[PDB]
Structure formats: C-alpha cells, structure tokens
C-alpha cells in the first residue's frame, strides 16, 4: 500500500534505499528480497538510511525495501498470556510449529498473536452507551487464571451502536462505535508502539 | 613509452596523471630530477606516488616515467661487507661518483660492481636436470663464505653448457635448455623485496643459538630460526645488546639494518666489525656481515625499504643452506613511516595514529624469518633468526608496535629503565621477559650437558624475590624470617653475579655454555646448602668474580661452599 | 566478465559497471598476465562495488585486468569425510589428501537457534585437568573460554584439552573441530604435529589460518569451523568439541576491515558491533531439543596488557558461561597449567557434577578446597607482613596447604591426564592436612566416608 | 615500648603517605585515560568526514 | 621574468590559497605584496593543478584579498652564508638585527641542508672538558656529539648553557651558534649579556626569534642556525658548538601549522612527523673523514608539565646521544647545576675517556659512583619515611648527601679539571667499605 523502496547501497550493517519518501522516521522495514529486519534512521529527500539488524551478507542494490508503516509496536489482545516472545514480539512457540525448524531464519515474519484462534467474547456493555478510551465493553476468559478485559482503544470516542456476545477471532469486528468521524469497528486486538 | 605528468606534490606524496600503462608497485623516476619513487595507488589514469627522496622543488607539469619493475635487490657476488642505503644503493660508490660527503638527489647506481672479476668454480655436470635453487657452482666471496650460484626461480630445464673461469656478474656462465627456449644465466639474480623468497618447507626452529649473553642463553633463549623482540626505553643500552648478539652468535651471516636511527651507530659498526677477529678462522666479523643504512634524517619512505631490503638478502643466503641473523634497529621507525604515510593518505588510523594494517605488516615480516628446507634437489637446511629493537615512548609497552609485535614473535627481551639507571646491564627485566622456546631449549641443553630444573629453580627464586619485594616496598624489611632473608640473598646472587654482564670486559663479554652451567650451579649450591641467617652470612666473593674466570677455578667453589 | 577496474588504493579496488552484486560476494581478478586472484565485496553501490583482494594488489594493471563476480559468498562444502582432514581458513586442503565431494554447500554465517529450542547442558566432560574438571567444570553444550596472554602457554593447554577431553561411558566419542586464527606457522605446526602424533587427528577437523594470511581470511575462519561443527552435530548427530585460538586475532581483523570501510571505532578502538559479532559466534553451540548431537565451545583469547576489562575478554564474558584464567605469576613459578582458580569460573558447573555424573563428594570438596586455598594464601601473606611469630599452628598448616595445592594439585603438567576419581582423591589427601575442625563446608556424613 | 613505636611509625607511613599516594595516582591516571579517549574519538570523527 | 599573480582566492589564519598559477613548486619561497605595500614572506605547502596553498611567516593580518599579489621567487627558503656572519645577530628569518652592514653572501644555502654519507662520517671521540663534574665524569661530552639539556619552566637551564659554552692538548676554540626560539626578552637578554661580558660574542652567530615575533617564523629559525653551523664547520674548517633554546617552542609552532592544515594528528595533537622533523635538525652534527671541522649540538628544551614522557623530550631523547636533565627537586635544594645524574646519559662517553684521553680510573669510578649514589638516594628516601635508624645503608645515605652537596653542586662559575673531578670522586668512594666497591677491579683499588 505504501511505496516500495529500492536499495542503492549496502555497506556492512548500513543500507540506503530510494523511493522511500512515503515511509516515516523510526519505521521498521523488511530489507532486500530476503526481507530482513531493519529500521529507518535517517531520511534525505526520498533516500532512507537504514540500520539492518540481521546479517547483510547476500543483499545488494536493486533489491526491494518494504516499510511496515509503523515504528516497533506490540499486538495486544487475547492470546498474549503464557506466550514467550523475543524482544520484538516474535512468537517463539509459533516459530517452531510453523517453520518446522529450530532456527529463526532471516526473512521469516510471523504475527505475534494467533489471528485464527476462536475466543468467547462476553458483552458487558449494552448499546447506546457513551464510551471513550479505557471503557470496558466486555471480557474474555483467556487463561485458567486471568480474565482479559476488552477496552475501548485510545483515540476512539463515541456511542456504542452494535455489540453482542459470541465466538470470534482477534480479527473479527465485535463492536460498532458511532464516533465524530463516523461509524468505526472494534476487534479484540489493539496495537501500541513500545 | 608513456610519459606521466605531475599534478600534485605534498611532501613525499606525488600524484601524476597519464600513467595508465603502469602497474601498482612499479618503481618510477619522478620530475625533472628523476627522483626514485613507487606507485602505491591508481585512480583512473592518476597514480599516487611515494617518493624515496626529498621532493623539494618538484611540482606540477614535470614528467614521470615508470621502470616497469617493482622495488628489487641485486643478489650476487660483491654483496658481503658492503654498506647500502634503504633501496640497496652502495653508499661508498655514491661517494666516489658524486665526489661528495653528502647524499644528493636523482642518482641511480647499480647495487653491485658489475665490472669486478670473480673466479666462478663450476660444480655441476652438463646434461643435468635442474630447477630453482639448484647450485651450478660457487665463488669464494670471502675466505670462509662460499657464494653459491643458484638456478633462479622461474628457470627449469637441462644444463647444456657450463665451465669454470673468470667472469663479471653480467657474463653468461651457463646455458639451460628450457621449454621456453635456451636461457642464459649469470652469477646474479634480481628479486622483489616485498615478496618472500620461496622455500620447499618451513621447519621447527629447535637448535638454540649461542649468544654468550648469560641472561638470554639461560632464561630467555632464542633458537636458529627464531624471532626475538627487544623493546626498551631510550638509554637502556639499546645498541650494545644488538652489537653483542651480532658479534657472538654462531650464525654464518649477519644482515644489520639501521632503520631510521643514528648515523654514527652505522659508522661505529663499519669501524668495529672489521677489527673483531674470529681466532678459529682469522677473518673479521665484517667478512660475514651485510649493512643496510637509512638514518633518521634520510627520506621517510626509505625506512620501509631498508627493512624489506634486509630480509630479502637474508633469505638469499638462507637459500644457500646458511644460518642467518637479521638485525632490525629499530622497527618502531618503520612503523612511524607507515603512520606518516597513512596520515597523508588520510586513512582511518588505528591506535596512536598507526594504520589499521599495522599488525598484519609486522606479521608478514616475521613470517619470513624461520628455519626452512630450501628449494633444490639437495634439500639444504637453512634459517633466519630475527632480532628486532622496539622503541615504545617512555618504555610503555602497551603501545601498538610492541603489542602487535609480541603477538607474532616468540621471545620477549624487555629492557628496563630502572635496571639501566642503577647500571644493571643488559637491563633485561627478568619478570617481564619471556621465551616461548624455553621448554624446547631446556630439553636440548639437558641432553647436551647431561639444567632444565636449575633454570626453572632460578626463575622461581627471581619470581619469589619479586613477590617478597611487593611487600617490603609497602611495609619494610622489618619482620623478615631467616628463610625469606635467604631467598633475597640467593636472588641477589643471581642478579649481581650472573645476570649483570659487561660487554666491554675482555672476558665477561662472552660466556660459553659450560661456563654458564658452572656459574649457575655454584650460585644454586650456596642457596641449597645455606637453606639446609646472620650466622651463615658472616662466614661468596669467589662467586661474585666467577664471571671473570677464563673452568676448574669455578667448579671448585662448590666444595668451599659446603665445607 | 568485467574489464572495469576504476581505482586501486592498497589491497582495495573499485569496480564499475556492476549489477546484481551483493555485499560479501566472492570475486575473481584475472590480471593482465593471466594470473588469478580472489577477493570479496566489502561494500557495494549502484554504479560500483568495493573489493579487497586476498593476495594483494601488487603488479596489477587496472586497464588490462578483468573482474568476475561469482554470484555467492564464501561457502563450506560439508561432508562426513572432513574428519581427519586439515584445511586452511578458506576451507582449502592443506594436507594434500584426496579430493572431497561435498554433500552440500552451506553459507558460513549460520542461523540463530530459537532460544526455547536449546536444551540444558547435562553431561560432565572430563578434561583430565583437575583445576578444570573439579573447580571449574566443563559441561556438554557450554561455552567456556580460556583467558590467556602473550607468552602464556595456552598453546599447550589447548593441545592438552583437545587431547584429553572425553565424556564418561557414552560409546560415542568426541569429534574435535580445531580453528587456528592468525597464529604463527610454528604454532600451527605444533598443533598439527600433536594431533598427528597422538592419533587425535582421526577424531578431528582442522581449519588453520596463519598470521600472514589476509584479514578477511581470519574473519572467515571461525565461521568455517563452526559451520562444520553444526553440520556434524545437528545434522549427523555427533558430539562436537570446538576449540578456537586466538580470538584476539579475529578481533584485530575486524578493525582492519572496519577501517577499510572508514567506520569510526567504538570503545577502545573496536567496532561497536563487536558484541553482535562475537555473540553470533559463541552462541553457535549447546544442545538442541530433539537432537542427539551437541556443540561445546572453548574459545581461547589473549588479553591485551593482561587486562580483563578490555573489550575482547569483557564482552566475551558477557556471552560465555564463565572463563578459565591463566596467570603470569603461576607460570613464572613453574605451575603447569598456570590456572588461577580464584578468578576462574564455570557457570554451569553445578549441572555436570554429583552422584551419577561424577561423585557425591564433588561439590563439597570443591567449596572446601577453594576456601582453604584462599585462607592459605592469606596465611602466607601474614607471615611476610608480621613474621612467622604471628602464625598460629592452624595457620602454619593453611600456608603449607596453599603451597602444596599449587605445586601438586594445580601443577599437574601439560601431559598428565587425571581421571575425576584421581583428582577428587588428591583433593582429599590435601584436605587431610587440616583438622576435622577446619573442614566446615563438608558434612560429617561424607567427611567420615572419604577423609584419610 | 620501642617495638610499639617502630610499629606505629610503619602504620602512620602507610596511613598518611603510602596509601594516599596510591589513591591520588590512581585517580589521576583514571582521569587522564578518560580524557584522551574522548579526544581520540573526537579526532576520528573528524578524520571520518575527510 | 618576475612571477607574480593577483589571484588570491582565500585567506585563513596563516594559510592562503592562490589560483590560476603555473610552474609553482613545492616548498618554494613566496612574498605577499599587500595593498599597502607591506611585504611578507611565505612558503608553498602544497601545489595541485593551478592552485598553491602557502603559509605566511609574519601572518595575514590586515590583508585585502582583491588588492594583494603573490610573488613566487623560484627557490626554497635560503641562508646567505659568509665568514662575515661571525659576531653578527640575525632575526628568525636570517635578516640582520644588529643595525650593522648587510652581508655580501659568499653563497646561498637551502636551509634544509644535506645528509652526510654514513660512510663519510668520522666517529666523535674527542673529550671536551666542560669543567662540570656531573658532565665530564659521568655524562662525558665529546666533540661532534649532540647532547641536549632537558629542563622545565623556571629552572636555570640558561645559566647551565651559558656556563658550558664559557668553559668548554690544543688551543682550538669553539665558534658558537646560538638560536633563540620563541624565548622572552629577558631570557634572550641573559645570553646577550653573558656573550658580551665574556667576549664570546665575537665568536658567535646568533639567530633571534622572540616571544613577540610571529610564531610561524620559528619553523625556519633552527634550520637557519644549523645551516650557518655546518657551513663554518665543513666549508671553513671550524669547530662549532650549537646551542638552541627553547626547542619546545619550535614544536609548538609545528603544531600550529599542523592544526591550521587540518592534518591527521599524532600524540597530543603534535603532527605524526615529529620524530622525523626533529631528526632533521639534531642529525646535523658530528665529523666527516678528512675534514678539520666539527658540529657539536646542545639543544635545550623545557619538558612540558615537567613530564619526560611528553612527546617533546621523549622523541628528542630517542634521537640525541644522551641527555642532561635538570630537576626542580635539586633546584629547590640550591644545587648548582641542578643536574640529576641518574636519569642523565651520554652515549659517546666510552670512546672519549680512559688512559691517554682522561685518566685510567675514569670508567670504573663513574660506574661505582652511579651505583653508590642510586643506593644512597634510595636509603635517604627510606630514612625520610621509616626513620634514620641498616648500618651499611646509613653509610650510603650519607654518601648521597655528600655527593649532591659537594660533587654535583659546584656553582655556575666553577671550572674543574678532569683530574680534580676524578680525585674528588675517589674521596667520596672512600666513605664506603672496600668490600662494597664491586664495580672496581683490584688493580685500580690498590692504586687509588
């Protein structure tokens, strides 16, 4: 959706890419065909200077750079408890299962939480209620001990229009809010920059 | 064909365009004067040139010509007993040609006398299959050193014609039938100083050198093919140590390189060496010595050249089956030449401004030393022993030259200013110094003499004295037991009666293996018997003066001690 | 093929009209005289690439020489037939033995082990050296480095460890991968000759890089060795001991290439990314869940000016599970190996010791020996400060304990192979010098079973 | 009494001279090392830009 | 055809850049003609394409770029030499400063001079009696040697230097070349006054750069001096003594230019070429086979922060043939001269001393005195910390005291014969038990 960059310089851990003018400072990027983890440190015109955090052996000019559109963030929602991540929220359990290897291959990118697991959402707010950030619209009994409270995300303010209990994944819209900017949909997951 | 033109001058660094025919490391004649230089860099058609002479008065628009050949040395009869500058120019012929006592610019003189007649004695039969290193004959360059004429590298075939006779080094003395046609050979070969002369096999240096200097031969020994570094502050007796090794070592030839140092020291060597006569031979030490001189006020870039010139000549003699010692004094001035050039190339410097490739350069030099089997059907055994002075500022051995050196050499003779000031010579710090050959030399000595234990015990006493003195300095000699007082007396004896040695005393200047054994035996004996305090001490002068004995007068001391 | 050399500045050279060129890609230079030299891309731009020639740039005519880009970085051709063979830093035959047909070619950087997929070190490794096995135990899968110094005998200790290392029972023997980094010929020959003279070469794969080899070869060496080790271990199910000396030479090589790319140094003149670099190397080790084989690592490094705060030993300590320390004071006294147990540490030691693993009295005797040693050294110092007058009867014993401990226990010799049993027994004979009253860290149950 | 006094002098030499001299020197070295390393990296960044 | 361009591009401190030039050479001497007609000399540091970067000796203050010109004089910096130089005073650039006649020069010399062929060198071994015991006996000065004085701010190095020049089998004298380098008025005036009073001024050539003179000038001054010296020695067969103070100010000037030029720095911001640069001065000394003259050097430098490890004294020491060190400790005790003989050295004392040169007892007594003094100085330092009360070390402590007070301390106007010095040394050795004199063999002990 945002413009894909082209590498113009690989020098040790430092990569430069042009056509990056729609990306932002501190954005996380996938560098090269391989798509290794990097971060945009500088910008001169359309040329971004990128620190690459994985081995840059084998990467060269020509290859693509894709920005992730955001700075380093966490996915927050049901399925975060009892999980073991690395520093950038890579799901270590999932890595084993999916890639079928003992290793974290360069270029392998997997979602932090499980976007396919069904959860029972229990609605505790009825329709027509005025809400803002922090208000609890319901809960999911996530683990054997902890009850995961589903809150109205930051930057959402308005009136609850449609909401009901049921089974959903963390990608399904469980709520409709009538805000100043119009009708918006909520899911059980929110993102936040660390 | 092509003539370059200068487009920049900045000290010893000169840039010339239109040099596209030339190659990296080519020697060149720079400017109207035709001063001698070397191409180090090439950007498009613009060559960066390092000049080995002063570049004052030189500037843009002057011509530059490449010679097409890298910096090389002439290797043949007439090389022994001369003195050359850093790039193997004869300093005496220089004097005769220019008729001057001073060193001027732009004169290109051949290294050797190409007109001098030698008797070539052919030793090889016609029809023989030969290759590199094979001896075809010899010349008596001195009364003892046979200058063996070898088949140069890159020559291979059958000897077609050869005969004894009187020739110059330019006359054809041999024709070999090669796959590249008939090729004529002279007594002389040229070789690039930055390339190691090839060998068949590198071997382990396991025969100890006899230096005759007690502290070295006993505690920090060097083998034939070994490499030793002597880092020391100024005024530590830097020079005398090297002179002693040069004059007393049992090698066949000595290559002495005065690198960025005082001119008067070169003058001293050429005056003293011819006067030092081997009594078993009757000829002087100069008749087995080659001198390379590039003084501290001679052109900077030529310091590097003197180092490589020296090692290449040593490898040439090595290839004949000879044991050679090369003296580099001092390596620090070489490293500073790298640093000045690095600065001028605006390279990213490493520690103290020295280039990032410093460790690697030193490694390349010392890896050229060593014991080898030379090329040739004979498989002759030969070796190069490297003795290098290092000059760390203030005697701080943490500096990059000393430190990178000690990662590639095997012997460390740390000179000490504290010892020097109280006139303890050679001022070798016995706690700081070490030899990675100690173990092997110990085995050898044990066998030859029928010693290892005594050297271990001697060092252990010295180490113990050191640990005791750490306390006495910050507490006082007050509460010392009789045992500790005895230890300090034994260590005193080792230091004053054995370690201390005057190079200027007629007798003390050299100590044989056997005399060394008897002296250490006597010292340890007193310690052992006394161990078995004020009482014993008041009842050792004979031990103190053992070093002056020309052998039964030393061995007999053991019985006087015990009684 | 490219006839497009634009610049030559030292061993570095800039090549134009490139495309599809990658960082660290291998290159080949065909000189005007037909001679062939190889190199590696140190940096690459749109128009050009910067390369360093392994053999140097002497005698190269730019206009008339050519460059060819191989399409790949350095790679190791793996095979079980590597065992008993000697290669150089770049994996090229050194022993002139028969040709190897590789099963597969691998890049030498490795992949990082999923932190949850690593298994805990369990098995005791008998090195045969009391001061290690007993006091600073090496466990299968650990990274336990030796901190040495210029003119310390880490050479002899490295040879001894490779020689004597074994795991009790198992049937499965140890395959040893030995990487020599930037060492002198004389030292390389010692290692190769010791491996041959003892038959240990039949268990080993050797990668020998010398002091006069290029800096980029020295950088490649550890990576070649570890790629071979992970293949033998994780793909073939072997138990692998990796020994590498000298790590300091590896670090110096980094600085050389870093300066060639005009990078501004970090702390004390080393690259800022030294941590990442060393951590990537040393963590290529340990057990893996579900897999039979393992990698155990013993990096050896010399400490510049004998300084443990130096970036090289300082960062290594942050990565490795402890360190074995050799000292000048012990060596000057003739103690072989000169291991100083007081600053030495193994962080995984409690996992490879006790009943089943060694013997029940392992832990207790270690604590006791450590404490009496420190106490005895204090007593020796007391005698020097205040005289033999000030020593009690118990104190005279501790002083004598520390003396014997250095001389008979630590000082075993570079060719002495002590079994754990022999070592523990010798510890008890030295602890027997002390009255029952002094042996506090040992419960009377085991004190009555073992004390002579 | 003589031994007491001789012991006392050695104690006071350490307490008022030897130890403080070592303390002051350590402080000095430590500072000077620190200064030079900052100056060194400053120059390297300058040489970098050249 | 006079080479002059009115194309000055930029002026930055002591550096100026000129463009659209041709045929300009490295190190070529230049003259800037300012808009007001003031003339200031300079030196080409760098030439590339049609540009030249030049350093201005007298600075660039008040210069208007547009209306100034640069003349290029077709030769490097030179000294006009003549026997007529004797008794004359010049400035830092070699211009007469005494309002006497202009010299009609016998020739011009490039002040960079030439390297003497190593094989042409004659080894210096001619004993020079300075009359100073600490020097004559222990740190012996020979004719053709380079032996510097290492001092510090506010120490009497000027007194020592003047005494040596005053007092140093023949009725040969020394022609003295004296170089003032960034010294204050009062420091320079001390020499002028001493030279005039002793009449030595009539044997002297002086080159004066003072603290208020432009600093870039000082890079030339000692080269000027040494060119004068080697001229009088090798072309006019004289014995020349060269005294230069303060060498430290020379090095500071080198650093100023090196900073201006944005060079890659060495230790302490001193250029990487410091050793080489200093060597080009100090190696201008010695003797030549077959030539009657000689050059003897006594450079004087103050050690900055009294630190012997400073690049200036350290590198100097690596070049010169020993050093004479003055200390603030000996100076505060009123020792004259305040020479610390323990860190002092002479590298050419061996071949200049002994029977038929000084006396047969020279070398032996020197070594025994050094060893006795080092042990006595050690015992004094012990007695000051642990108290006055071994029996033998107490003897050494008294020796070191008598040695400093009676042997080293003699006064700046006391001129002792070598015999008097050696005999006095024996009087001090007589303090020690004969058993302790282990550096001296039986034959010398029995005799003296």
Swiss-Prot record, chain A:
One GO MF term attached to the UniProt entry: proton-transporting ATPase activity, rotational mechanism
Source domain of life is: Bacteria
* Cellular component annotations (GO), alphabetically ordered: proton-transporting ATP synthase complex
GO annotation (BP), single: proton motive force-driven plasma membrane ATP synthesis
- Tell me the keywords, alphabetical order: ATP-binding, Ion transport, Nucleotide-binding, Sodium, Sodium transport, Translocase, Transport
On induction, the UniProt comment says: By increasing intracellular Na(+) concentration.
Q: Which family does it belong to?
A: Belongs to the ATPase alpha/beta chains family.
User: What job does this protein perform?
Assistant: Involved in ATP-driven sodium extrusion.
Name of protein: V-type sodium ATPase catalytic subunit A
Which species is this UniProt entry from?
Enterococcus hirae (strain ATCC 9790 / DSM 20160 / JCM 8729 / LMG 6399 / NBRC 3181 / NCIMB 6459 / NCDO 1258 / NCTC 12367 / WDCM 00089 / R)
Q: Which residues of the full protein are shown?
A: 1 to 193 of 593
Swiss-Prot record, chain C:
Signal peptide extent? none
Superkingdom of origin organism: Bacteria
Q: Which InterPro entries match?
A: ATP-synt_VA_C (IPR055190), ATPase_a/bsu_AS (IPR020003), ATPase_F1/V1/A1_a/bsu_N (IPR004100), ATPase_F1/V1/A1_a/bsu_nucl-bd (IPR000194), P-loop_NTPase (IPR027417), V-ATPase_su_B/beta (IPR022879)
Question: Could you tell me what induces this protein?
Answer: By increasing intracellular Na(+) concentration.
Q: Give GO terms for biological process.
A: proton motive force-driven plasma membrane ATP synthesis; sodium ion transport
Keywords, in A-Z order = Ion transport, Sodium, Sodium transport, Transport
Alphabetized PROSITE patterns for the sequence: ATPASE_ALPHA_BETA (PS00152)
Entry's Pfam families? Answer: ATP-synt_ab, ATP-synt_ab_N, ATP-synt_VA_C
Q: List the Gene Ontology MF annotations in alphabetical order.
A: ATP binding; proton-transporting ATP synthase activity, rotational mechanism
NCBIfam families, sorted: PRK04196.1
PANTHER family tied to this protein: V-TYPE PROTON ATPASE SUBUNIT B
What the entry lists under HAMAP family is as follows: ATP_synth_B_arch
Q: Name the family the entry cites.
A: Belongs to the ATPase alpha/beta chains family.
Relate the protein's function as given in its record: Involved in ATP-driven sodium extrusion.
- This protein is called what? V-type sodium ATPase subunit B
- Native species: Enterococcus hirae (strain ATCC 9790 / DSM 20160 / JCM 8729 / LMG 6399 / NBRC 3181 / NCIMB 6459 / NCDO 1258 / NCTC 12367 / WDCM 00089 / R)
Q: What would be the name of the gene that encodes this protein?
A: ntpB
Swiss-Prot record, chain E:
Q: What NCBIfam families does UniProt report for this protein, alphabetically?
A: PRK04196.1 (NF003235)
Protein's job = Involved in ATP-driven sodium extrusion.
Q: Does the keyword Transport apply?
A: yes
**Record protein name field:** V-type sodium ATPase subunit B
What keywords appear on the UniProt entry? Ion transport, Sodium, Sodium transport, Transport
Q: Which PANTHER family match?
A: V-TYPE PROTON ATPASE SUBUNIT B (PTHR43389:SF4)
Family membership noted in the UniProt record: Belongs to the ATPase alpha/beta chains family.
The record's GO molecular-function terms, alphabetically, read: ATP binding; proton-transporting ATP synthase activity, rotational mechanism
* Keyword Ion transport assigned: yes
Entry-linked Gene3D superfamilies: 3.40.50.12240
Some GO term, biological process aspect, for this entry: which one? proton motive force-driven plasma membrane ATP synthesis
What PROSITE patterns does this protein's entry cite?
Answer: ATPASE_ALPHA_BETA (PS00152)
What the record says about the induction of its expression is: By increasing intracellular Na(+) concentration.
Kindly give the Pfam families that the UniProt entry links to this protein: ATP-synt_ab, ATP-synt_ab_N, ATP-synt_VA_C
> What is the primary gene name for this protein?
ntpB
HAMAP family in alphabetical order: ATP_synth_B_arch
């Amino acid at each position: 959706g945002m413009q894909i960059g082209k590498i113009i310089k690989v020098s040790g851990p430092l990569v430069m890419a042009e056509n990056m003018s729609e990306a932002s400072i501190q954005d996380m990027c996938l560098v090269g065909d391989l798509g290794v983890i990097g971060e945009i440190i500088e910008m001169r015109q359309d040329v971004a200077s990128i620190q690459v955090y994985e081995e840059t052996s084998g990467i060269g000019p020509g290859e693509p750079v894709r920005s992730t559109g955001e700075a380093l963030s966490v996915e927050l929602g049901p399925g975060i408890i009892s999980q073991m991540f690395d520093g950038i929220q890579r799901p270590l359990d999932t890595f084993m299962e999916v890639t079928q290897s003992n290793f974290l291959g360069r270029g392998v990118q997997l979602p932090a939480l499980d976007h396919e697991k069904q959860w029972w959402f229990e609605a505790t707010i009825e329709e027509g209620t005025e809400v803002s950030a922090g208000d609890i619209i319901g809960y999911v009994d996530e683990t054997k001990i902890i009850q995961h409270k589903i809150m109205v995300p930051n930057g959402i303010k308005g009136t609850v229009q449609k909401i009901e209990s049921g089974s959903f994944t963390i990608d399904d819209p469980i709520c409709v809010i009538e805000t100043e900017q119009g009708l918006k949909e909520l899911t059980m997951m929110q993102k936040w920059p660390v | 064909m092509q003539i370059g033109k200068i487009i920049k001058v900045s000290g010893p660094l000169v840039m010339a365009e239109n040099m596209s025919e030339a190659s990296i490391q080519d020697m060149c004649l720079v400017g109207d004067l035709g001063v001698i230089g070397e191409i180090i860099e090439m950007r498009q058609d613009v060559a960066s040139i390092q000049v080995y002479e002063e570049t004052s008065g030189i500037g843009p628009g002057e011509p530059v010509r490449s010679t097409g050949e890298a910096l090389s040395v002439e290797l043949g009869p007439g090389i022994i007993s001369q003195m050359f500058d850093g790039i193997q120019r004869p300093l005496d012929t220089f004097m005769e040609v220019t008729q001057s006592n001073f060193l001027g610019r732009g004169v290109q003189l051949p290294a050797l006398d190409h007109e001098k007649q030698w008797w070539f004695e052919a030793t090889i039969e016609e029809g023989t299959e030969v290759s590199a290193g094979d001896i075809i004959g010899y010349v008596d360059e001195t009364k003892i050193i046979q200058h063996k004429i070898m088949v140069p590298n890159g020559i291979k075939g059958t000897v077609q014609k050869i005969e004894s006779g009187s020739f110059t080094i330019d006359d054809p003395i041999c024709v070999i039938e090669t796959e590249q046609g008939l090729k004529e050979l002279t007594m002389m070969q040229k070789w690039p100083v930055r390339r190691g002369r090839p060998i068949k096999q590198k071997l382990n240096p396991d025969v100890p050198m006899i230096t005759g200097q007690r502290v070295i031969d006993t505690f920090f020994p060097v083998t034939k093919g070994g490499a030793a570094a002597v880092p020391g502050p100024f005024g530590a007796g830097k020079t005398v140590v090297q002179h002693q090794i040069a004059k007393w070592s049992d090698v066949d030839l000595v290559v002495y390189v005065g690198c960025g140092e005082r001119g008067n020291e070169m003058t001293d060597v050429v005056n003293e060496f011819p006067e030092l006569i081997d009594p078993n031979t009757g000829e002087s030490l100069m008749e087995r010595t080659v001198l390379i001189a590039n003084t501290s006020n001679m052109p900077v870039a030529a310091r590097e050249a003197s180092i490589y010139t020296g090692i290449t000549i040593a490898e040439y003699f090595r290839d004949m089956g000879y044991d050679v010692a090369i003296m580099a004094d001092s390596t620090s001035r070489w490293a500073e030449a790298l640093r000045e050039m690095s600065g001028r190339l605006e390279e990213m410097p490493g520690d103290e401004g020295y280039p990032a490739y410093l460790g690697s350069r030193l490694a390349e030099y010392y890896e050229r030393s060593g014991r080898v089997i030379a090329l040739g059907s004979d498989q002759r055994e030969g070796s190069i022993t490297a003795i290098s002075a290092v000059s760390p500022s203030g005697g701080d051995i943490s500096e990059p030259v000393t430190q990178n050196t000690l990662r590639v050499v095997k012997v460390f003779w740390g000179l000490d200013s504290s010892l020097a000031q109280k006139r303890h010579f050679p001022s070798i710090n016995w706690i700081q110094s070490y030899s990675l050959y100690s173990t092997e030399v110990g085995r050898y000595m044990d066998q030859i003499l029928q010693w290892s234990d005594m050297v271990t015990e001697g060092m252990r006493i010295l180490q113990e004295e050191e640990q005791l003195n750490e306390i006495v300095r910050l507490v006082g000699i007050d509460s010392l037991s009789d045992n500790d007082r005895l230890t300090l007396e034994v260590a005193k004896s080792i230091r004053e009666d054995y370690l201390q040695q005057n190079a200027f005393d007629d007798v003390d200047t050299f100590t044989s293996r056997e005399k060394q054994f008897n002296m250490l035996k006597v010292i340890l004996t007193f310690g052992k018997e006394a161990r078995k305090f004020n009482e014993i001490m008041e009842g050792r002068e004979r031990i103190s003066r053992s070093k002056y004995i020309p052998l039964a007068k030393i061995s007999s001391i053991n019985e006087e001690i015990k009684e | 093929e490219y006839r497009t050399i634009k610049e030559v500045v030292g061993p570095l050279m800039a090549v134009e009209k490139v495309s599809g060129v990658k960082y660290e890609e291998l290159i080949e230079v065909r000189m005007q005289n037909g001679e062939i030299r190889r190199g590696q891309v140190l940096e690459v731009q749109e128009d050009k690439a910067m390369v360093q020639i392994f053999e140097g740039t002497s005698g190269i005519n730019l206009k008339n020489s050519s460059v060819r880009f191989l399409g790949h970085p350095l790679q190791l051709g793996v095979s079980e037939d590597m065992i008993g063979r000697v290669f150089d830093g770049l994996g090229r035959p050194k022993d002139n033995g028969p040709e190897i047909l590789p099963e597969k070619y691998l890049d030498i950087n490795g992949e990082v082990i999923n932190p949850i997929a690593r298994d805990y070190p369990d098995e005791f490794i008998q090195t045969g050296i009391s001061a290690i096995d007993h006091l600073n135990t090496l466990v299968r899968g650990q990274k336990l480095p030796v901190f040495s110094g210029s003119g310390l005998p880490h050479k002899e200790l490295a040879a001894q460890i490779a020689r004597q290392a074994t795991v009790l029972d198992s049937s499965d023997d140890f395959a040893v991968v030995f990487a020599a980094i930037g060492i002198t010929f004389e030292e390389a020959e010692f290692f190769m000759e010791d491996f041959r003279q003892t038959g240990a070469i039949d268990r080993s794969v050797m990668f020998m890089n010398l002091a006069n080899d290029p800096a980029i070869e020295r950088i490649a060496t550890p990576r070649m060795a570890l790629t071979a080790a992970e293949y033998l271990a994780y793909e073939k199910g072997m138990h692998v001991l990796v020994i590498m000396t000298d790590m300091t030479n590896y670090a110096e090589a980094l600085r050389e290439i870093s300066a060639a790319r005009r990078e501004v140094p970090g702390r004390r003149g080393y690259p800022g990314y030294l941590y990442t670099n060393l951590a990537t190397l040393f963590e290529r080790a340990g057990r893996i869940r579900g897999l039979k084989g393992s990698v155990t690592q013993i990096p050896i490094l010399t400490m510049p000016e004998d300084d443990k705060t130096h970036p090289i030993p300082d960062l290594t300590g942050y990565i490795t599970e402890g360190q074995i320390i050799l000292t000048r004071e012990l060596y000057k006294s003739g103690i072989q190996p000169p291991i100083d147990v007081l600053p030495s540490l193994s962080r995984l030691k409690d996992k490879g010791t006790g009943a089943g693993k060694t013997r029940e009295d392992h832990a207790a005797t270690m604590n006791q020996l450590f404490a009496a040693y420190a106490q005895g050294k204090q007593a020796k110092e007391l005698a020097v400060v205040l005289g033999e007058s000030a020593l009690s009867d118990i104190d005279k014993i501790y002083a004598k304990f520390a003396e014997r401990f250095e001389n008979e226990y630590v000082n075993q010799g570079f060719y002495t192979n002590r079994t754990i049993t022999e070592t523990l027994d010798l510890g008890w004979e030295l602890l027997a010098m002390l009255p029952r009253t002094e042996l506090k860290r040992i419960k009377d149950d085991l004190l009555d079973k073992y004390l002579p | 009494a003589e031994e007491i006094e001789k012991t006392r002098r050695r104690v006071n030499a350490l307490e008022y001279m030897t130890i403080p001299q070592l303390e002051e020197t350590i402080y000095y070295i430590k500072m000077k090392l620190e200064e030079n390393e900052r100056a060194e990296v400053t120059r390297l960044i300058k040489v970098k830009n050249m």
